Ligand binder design. Structure first.
Ligand SMILES: CCCCCCCCCCCCCCCCCC(=O)OC[C@H](COP(=O)([O-])OCC(O)COP(=O)([O-])OC[C@@H](COC(=O)CCCCCCCCCCCCCCCCC)OC(=O)CCCCCCCCCCCCCCCCC)OC(=O)CCCCCCCCCCCCCCCCC
Ligand SMILES: CCCCCCCCCCCCCCCCCC(=O)OC[C@H](COP(=O)([O-])OCC(O)COP(=O)([O-])OC[C@@H](COC(=O)CCCCCCCCCCCCCCCCC)OC(=O)CCCCCCCCCCCCCCCCC)OC(=O)CCCCCCCCCCCCCCCCC
Ligand SMILES: CCCCCCCCCCCCCCCCCC(=O)OC[C@H](COP(=O)([O-])OCC(O)COP(=O)([O-])OC[C@@H](COC(=O)CCCCCCCCCCCCCCCCC)OC(=O)CCCCCCCCCCCCCCCCC)OC(=O)CCCCCCCCCCCCCCCCC
Ligand SMILES: CCCCCCCC/C=C\CCCCCCCC(=O)OC[C@H](COP(=O)(O)OCCN)OC(=O)CCCCCCC/C=C\CCCCCCCC
Ligand SMILES: NC(=O)c1ccc[n+]([C@@H]2O[C@H](COP(=O)([O-])OP(=O)(O)OC[C@H]3O[C@@H](n4cnc5c(N)ncnc54)[C@H](O)[C@@H]3O)[C@@H](O)[C@H]2O)c1
Lengths: 417, 75, 120, 50, 68, 134, 198, 75, 75, 75, 75
């Protein structure tokens, strides 16, 4: 019946930059308008790892097929796609130039470039993460690993002895609460000390470059720091990982507060991949300070260049950069963008809702729900100390969530509401 | 009562029907995996993975049937 | 010079106590799942291998099955004697009701049970 | 021109152009002759004309 | 059969076409007959060791085979 | 990336009949297993034609060619860019068949494993050519 | 068994014991094979488990151990066919027709010789009925040969040949290779004698 | 009562249905293994391995039902 | 009592169901053998040795059914 | 006796099921023999012997059923 | 008694099942014979003989079935 729109055009009326969240919006943007518009999508990476199930994945509760998804799947068939990153953006002309060089015009622009991982911020990190034996671990799997490599699942298991370091980069970074696995490791490593699998002379410290774990929610961060001390874990703030030596297992840390760098032997190193601001967004005069998009906190519309929007992680929003937060940010963009093409007003406001689970134990978790003002809902930090209630919620997220991201990309299942 | 009870255990037996088709369905899947391998054995790991995956989906139905069985046997 | 004539191709395995130590138990077998709890971890920690565990549970199973089968014979009436007395009188109540509503010919044979639904 | 051994190991990878009328085991060796004879036949003509 | 002629016997495709037309060379016009001709010489190269004349072209002379 | 409607090339080591032609509408030949038909949009594939007949339909009559030939053997390749090339050892028309001139001294063969297939093929082609004349 | 006819009151004594010996010692062959594997014997049969539950695998391991024996015991039904098929032939031959009409100068005058003996079968007896009895005879014996010859092979080719091909093997790796190099050195010591062409 | 038992013994007979499909399913897997072998007999090892592995899953379902049979027969 | 006996014999008849499928699975297995043999007869022995092996497993289940057959008939 | 005899004779009718599958397995087998013969007629006798040979494995189940049939019909 | 006679005539109907499978098996046999002839028409006579021969084996099951039927119908 309907024919697939053309991709070999000079300009469009809507343009999405991103496939993880920029694809879910496009697929949602068409069904809301019934395909009255021709929209183009342009991502950079071919694969989208489901970081929302990263911890169940490290527990091998989620197979590699249910954790690895291609970017094409998120985008529908009607809308064309091309894996070329934007080389520059000219809001004054309402156009976008790609790496190849083909100028493309637009009427409304949606940016979902999020936070780009930069392994080069830490010398020798990627080369040690790719080694199938070295005890250096990270938050995502490199693209060189095949289906037979399961090094990701050996961070907690293969910690027989030595000094362990869980490093957190400088904010802004991706995976604030959905990649914190220092509560499950403690429970698993508490058993190893009981029957001798883990040497008694070991050291585990959390190297947090930032001053607080959760920046836009004081209730959650206060709970974390409260629980970390109750467990007996040590932390070091203002310190960020700088270099990793794969030969002698040396980790170079630096205290940004004092500027004093040190070298520490490691035997099990985990780090959340650090992000990096993209210059093409700063050269166009769109980001503000840190490098995030300067957009409205309610409508997500950019301050200047009203024809441009922004959501996901690249947006500067006083909230936790989660995925469920994206579910409420795509429903707003598809609404406002629908109103800009019709000249109508923008009646869609984003409340700042964000929902991400915090794994408090090997098989227990609690949801970190909070709005813009850090105010939590009925689910905020409930059944946190374990129990039958937290046990069931854990199984619902590990054994029943990865099977849902297939529909989200297909379109069979939309957001929560 | 006993009549409805007789049908309950009777349905419980019917669950062995997919078990039969699951056996036949497995032979066909692996028979193709063999032929698919002799054609181009360069993709052992690939074809092999795709094989077991499909088989896993089959056991889903098999377990689903048995689950339906005990359920209807007591509900 | 016996090592001169030793073939290193036998290094493909490291056999110790009838087990190869170069076995990827982290990717295959009952030991692959990392979501195992405190009990299952302490169970594998003792035996170090699923082949040895399965071997011992093979015999320990008959012990438990042969024991519970005895306790259910010696004991058991403590929890099921009520359901047996229930089905006893119930088996007599429905029988007594059958003789009331059933076609018995000149001999005591229900030759027309399909006379109606209640008779069936 | 590459030898026979290198040609066969390279030809087995052929998958875009289907070969089922004659099976690949036969087609690989046949088209090898065509690949080799074509160059030889062309070379002789160029040299003979020269 | 062109397939088994090569599998169970080292008969190349070209030699097969030659044996194929061998029985019909006379039926074909003289134009084609002059084309089906192979006559050259092979020498194992010392001053005068060997001088081989390749003229049969159907048996194990030009296109050797396993069966021969 | 892609090519126009189609292009066919029929070549012979001693003469080139069609360097590139587009008027033809369909091609049919006999392989070892069965007869095939190659026309526009035919997917990529390789073929090896024994000494059988080759018939090709022409939308516009081409000079000096009849469209019905008996080849002694050739290779066929259908490139990815919707292009098929026919290369045969030799070609001629049925009108120049000159039947009944077979078995004129080349009947003798050798009793070997290779001579067996040699005679097998020779007999197969004879029965084929005899039918091709009809 | 002919040479054992006078050794006892049962001509088939040695045969009735051997079928039992054949059964018990074949029954112990798999049992001794598991003892040889050791405590890992279940991995030799089924391989690596799938579920973390020991109770779950316990059931899948009992099946493999049962199947391990069923492959053996289920083959004794082949011996039942060979016996049943062999008895049916003996019953047909032992009950085959033999009368005084086939005897030369019979003296059994009381066995239907002086009685009126008609029948209700097809006439032309030796052309119609009697051949048909021989036709069925040829079927009973051809069906027997094909059965006993076939079940005999399938029994030993499955109980011993295939059974041991599945659970036993030989390694290709070696631990010592000193014959290869000694033969080379020895061949240089006898180089002069070989030059004389022995 | 007595009829429920009569159905139980009957359900036990139904278990012989996968036994039938397992035979057909086995002949098919070994039928392709032959052809797959003739097409490329160099790779006997890999193909043969996949055969028995596939066979295992096939028979696995067979005895699974038999277990289910005796279960319903006494439970 | 007499009813379950009539069912016991009825189940014993069902055991002839695999006996039917085993025949079909054979014709299919031997068909693949012929095609596989015509494809590459030089490797007959390998193709063949695998044939009987498969067949052995086929009729094994058949005998297995007869086992359960007489069991339920007398147990 | 007479009641069980009625189901006995009925079970004997079940033996005609393999008689059906054996026919289909035959039609399929000779089909493979014919098509396989065309592809490689050089080994005709080989294929031919294996064809009838395979068929012998078909009537195996046939006679087995009838034997088992008359058996339970009287045992 | 009377029911034993009724099941006998019922079994006699069961004999029509191989009659059905024999038809399908025959069509399949000739289906392959057609394609087989097109592959190698030089041996049409050989293929043809094998075609009818296989069919003869099919009618064997047929005569075998009706024979059993008429027997059980009168014995
Ligand atoms: C009831 C009738 C009884 C009849 C008489 C019986 C007599 C028996 C006598 C002998 C006793 C048995 C001996 C058993 C050992 C034998 C040897 C052996 O087998 O090896 C060890 C073996 C080890 O097991 P395993 O297989 O290795 O473990 C599995 C995984 O490895 C484990 O993996 P994991 O370790 O990684 O993690 C496990 C778990 C994580 O585990 C945990 O985290 C739990 C740990 C908690 C520890 C808490 C400690 C508390 C402190 C102690 C007390 C302190 C006192 C405090 C003060 C008190 C003051 C008074 O994670 C999970 O999520 C598990 C999956 C989800 C649970 C599934 C359960 C399904 C059951 C459904 C039944 C529902 C019934 C509800 C009814 C409720 C109300 C009645 O032990 C057993 O097998 C136990 C026996 C199991 C038999 C099961 C048979 C029954 C099947 C289910 C029947 C369902 C009910 C039917 C009736 C219903 C009627 C209403
Ligand atoms: C009416 C009767 C019907 C029944 C008839 C049955 C007749 C069958 C006869 C069969 C022959 C039996 C003879 C067995 C000889 C055993 C000799 C021996 O001891 O050598 C050891 C030998 C094992 O040594 P290995 O394999 O050479 O190497 C060992 C490795 O080096 C070791 O490496 P690893 O160090 O890493 O291993 C770790 C450890 C792992 O061990 C574990 O799994 C751990 C278990 C947990 C322990 C509890 C832990 C509690 C922790 C509490 C912690 C609390 C602390 C709390 C904190 C405290 C704080 C202060 O493994 C072990 O050390 C244990 C291995 C020895 C287990 C022995 C199992 C066999 C017992 C059989 C009992 C039957 C007796 C009667 C026999 C009757 C004969 C007429 O045992 C065997 O090999 C057993 C083989 C059995 C094969 C035959 C199976 C026959 C199956 C029959 C059933 C057929 C069913 C189907 C029938 C169908 C119809 C017919
Ligand atoms: C202008 C016109 C002038 C002429 C016009 C008139 C022409 C004459 C018209 C005829 C009038 C009626 C005749 C009445 C007088 C009969 C007197 C007599 O001695 O009969 C005794 C004789 C025995 O009866 P019986 O002693 O009274 O016992 C009473 C019951 O049978 C007892 O009941 P039971 O059930 O207990 O008995 C068992 C039953 C058993 O059940 C059976 O009946 C067995 C049947 C199986 C065989 C059936 C197939 C036979 C034909 C196959 C040939 C087909 C070829 C074409 C195929 C095309 C396919 C589409 O019977 C027997 O066992 C009989 C066994 C003795 C016969 C077997 C040996 C014979 C030797 C044959 C060798 C022939 C070589 C050539 C020699 C020629 C000169 C002698 O009666 C007959 O058999 C009647 C025969 C009628 C002929 C049937 C058709 C024969 C076709 C042959 C074609 C080949 C030759 C072509 C010639 C073409 C000429 C144009
Ligand atoms: C290709 C054709 C098919 C092959 C046919 C082969 C069988 C041919 C039979 C030819 C028989 C012709 C002569 C028979 C005469 C002798 C027997 C005879 O007369 O029948 C005796 C009698 C019937 O007599 P009544 O029923 O009482 O009728 C009396 C009417 N007032 O029948 C018999 O006794 C059976 C005959 C003796 C059987 C002996 C068995 C011999 C064993 C043979 C096996 C050979 C083993 C080889 C090593
Ligand atoms: N835990 C982690 O480390 C992590 C990392 C990435 C994403 N996530 C999850 O993903 C959720 C949403 O992800 P997101 O949409 O905010 O960002 P993203 O990580 O999904 O990347 C944005 C998409 O646009 C592409 N992109 C980036 N720069 C581009 C450029 N110049 N040109 C073209 N394409 C470009 C990317 O390849 C990607 O397809 C987040 O809420 C978070 O939960 C987590």
């Amino acid at each position: 019946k309907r024919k697939k729109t053309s991709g070999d055009l000079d300009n469009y009326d809507v343009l999405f930059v991103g496939a993880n969240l920029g694809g879910i919006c496009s697929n949602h943007f068409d069904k809301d308008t019934h395909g009255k518009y021709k929209c183009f999508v342009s991502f950079d990476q071919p694969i989208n790892q489901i970081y929302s199930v990263r911890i169940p994945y490290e527990q091998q509760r989620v197979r590699k097929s249910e954790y690895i998804h291609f970017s094409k799947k998120s985008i529908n068939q009607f809308t064309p796609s091309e894996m070329l990153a934007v080389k520059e953006i000219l809001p004054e002309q309402n156009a976008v130039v790609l790496s190849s060089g083909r100028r493309i015009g637009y009427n409304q622009l949606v940016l979902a470039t999020g936070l780009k991982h930069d392994f080069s911020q830490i010398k020798g990190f990627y080369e040690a993460l790719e080694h199938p034996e070295h005890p250096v671990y990270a938050n995502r799997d490199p693209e060189t690993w095949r289906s037979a490599q399961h090094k990701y699942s050996k961070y907690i298991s293969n910690f027989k002895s030595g000094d362990g370091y869980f490093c957190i980069p400088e904010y802004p970074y991706a995976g604030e609460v959905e990649c914190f696995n220092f509560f499950v490791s403690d429970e698993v490593w508490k058993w190893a000390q009981h029957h001798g699998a883990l040497s008694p002379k070991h050291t585990f410290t959390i190297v947090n470059a930032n001053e607080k774990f959760v920046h836009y929610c004081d209730s959650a961060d206060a709970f974390i720091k409260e629980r970390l001390e109750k467990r007996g874990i040590r932390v070091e703030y203002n310190t960020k990982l700088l270099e990793v030596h794969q030969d002698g297992q040396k980790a170079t840390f630096i205290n940004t507060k004092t500027g004093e760098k040190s070298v520490r032997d490691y035997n099990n190193l985990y780090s959340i991949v650090p992000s990096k601001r993209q210059e093409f967004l700063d050269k166009a005069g769109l980001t503000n300070g840190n490098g995030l998009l300067n957009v409205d906190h309610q409508t997500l519309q950019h301050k200047k260049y009203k024809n441009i929007f922004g959501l996901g992680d690249a947006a500067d929003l006083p909230t936790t950069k989660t995925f469920w937060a994206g579910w409420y940010q795509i429903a707003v963009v598809r609404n406002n963008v629908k109103r800009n093409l019709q000249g109508q007003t923008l009646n869609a406001h984003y409340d700042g809702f964000s929902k991400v689970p915090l794994f408090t134990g090997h098989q227990t978790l609690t949801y970190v729900a909070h709005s813009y003002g850090g105010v939590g809902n009925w689910q905020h930090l409930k059944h946190n100390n374990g129990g039958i209630l937290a046990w069931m919620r854990y199984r619902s997220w590990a054994k029943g969530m990865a099977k849902k991201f297939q529909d989200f990309y297909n379109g069979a299942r939309l957001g929560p509401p | 009562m006993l009549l409805v009870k007789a049908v309950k255990v009777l349905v419980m037996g019917g669950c062995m029907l997919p078990i039969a088709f699951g056996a036949l369905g497995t032979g066909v899947l692996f028979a193709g995996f063999n032929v698919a391998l002799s054609r181009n054995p360069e993709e052992t790991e690939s074809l092999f993975n795709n094989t077991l995956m499909g088989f896993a989906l089959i056991e889903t139905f098999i377990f689903m049937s048995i689950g339906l069985g005990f359920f209807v046997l007591f509900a | 010079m016996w090592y001169k004539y030793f073939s290193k191709q036998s290094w493909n395995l490291r056999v110790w106590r009838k087990a190869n130590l170069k076995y990827n138990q982290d990717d295959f077998g009952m030991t692959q799942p990392k979501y195992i709890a405190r009990f299952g971890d302490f169970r594998f920690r003792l035996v170090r291998t699923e082949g040895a565990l399965r071997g011992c549970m093979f015999f320990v199973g008959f012990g438990c099955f042969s024991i519970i089968n005895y306790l259910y014979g010696r004991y058991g009436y403590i929890i099921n004697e009520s359901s047996q007395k229930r089905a006893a009188q119930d088996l007599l109540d429905n029988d007594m009701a059958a003789d009331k509503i059933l076609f018995k010919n000149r001999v005591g044979a229900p030759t027309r049970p399909l006379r109606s639904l209640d008779d069936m | 021109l590459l030898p026979r051994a290198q040609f066969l190991n390279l030809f087995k990878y052929v998958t875009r152009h289907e070969a089922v009328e004659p099976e690949l085991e036969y087609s690989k060796n046949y088209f090898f002759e065509l690949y080799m004879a074509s160059s030889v036949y062309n070379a002789l003509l160029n040299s003979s004309a020269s | 059969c062109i397939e088994f002629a090569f599998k169970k016997a080292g008969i190349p495709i070209v030699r097969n076409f030659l044996h194929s037309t061998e029985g019909v060379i006379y039926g074909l016009p003289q134009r084609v007959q002059r084309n089906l001709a192979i006559n050259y010489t092979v020498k194992q190269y010392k001053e005068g060791k060997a001088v081989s004349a390749k003229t049969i072209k159907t048996l194990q002379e030009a296109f050797p085979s396993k069966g021969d | 990336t892609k090519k126009q409607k189609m292009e066919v090339t029929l070549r012979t080591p001693y003469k080139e009949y069609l360097a590139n032609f587009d008027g033809f509408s369909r091609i049919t030949a006999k392989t070892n297993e069965a007869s095939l038909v190659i026309q526009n949009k035919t997917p990529a594939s390789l073929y090896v034609l024994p000494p059988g007949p080759l018939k090709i339909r022409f939308t516009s009559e081409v000079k000096n060619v009849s469209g019905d030939f008996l080849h002694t053997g050739g290779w066929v390749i259908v490139h990815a860019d919707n292009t098929c090339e026919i290369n045969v050892m030799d070609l001629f028309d049925r009108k120049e068949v000159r039947a009944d001139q077979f078995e004129k001294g080349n009947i003798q063969d050798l009793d070997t494993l290779a001579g067996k297939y040699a005679a097998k093929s020779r007999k197969s082609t004879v029965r084929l050519f005899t039918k091709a004349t009809t | 068994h002919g040479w054992t006819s006078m050794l006892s009151h049962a001509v088939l004594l040695l045969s009735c014991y051997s079928i039992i010996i054949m059964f018990l010692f074949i029954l112990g062959m798999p049992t001794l094979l598991l003892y040889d594997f050791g405590i890992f014997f279940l991995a030799y049969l089924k391989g690596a488990g799938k579920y973390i539950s020991s109770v779950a695998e316990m059931m899948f391991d009992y099946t493999a151990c049962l199947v391990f024996y069923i492959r053996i015991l289920a083959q004794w039904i082949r011996v039942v066919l060979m016996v049943v098929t062999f008895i049916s032939l003996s019953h047909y031959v032992s009950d085959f027709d033999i009368t005084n009409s086939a005897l030369i100068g019979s003296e059994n005058q009381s066995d239907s010789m002086n009685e009126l003996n008609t029948n209700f079968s097809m006439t032309y007896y030796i052309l119609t009925v009697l051949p048909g009895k021989f036709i069925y005879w040829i079927y009973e014996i051809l069906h027997t040969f094909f059965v006993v010859c076939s079940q005999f092979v399938a029994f030993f080719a499955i109980v011993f040949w295939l059974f041991l091909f599945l659970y036993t093997f030989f390694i290709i790796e070696k631990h010592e290779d000193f014959f290869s190099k000694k033969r080379e050195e020895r061949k240089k010591k006898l180089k002069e004698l070989w030059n004389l062409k022995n």
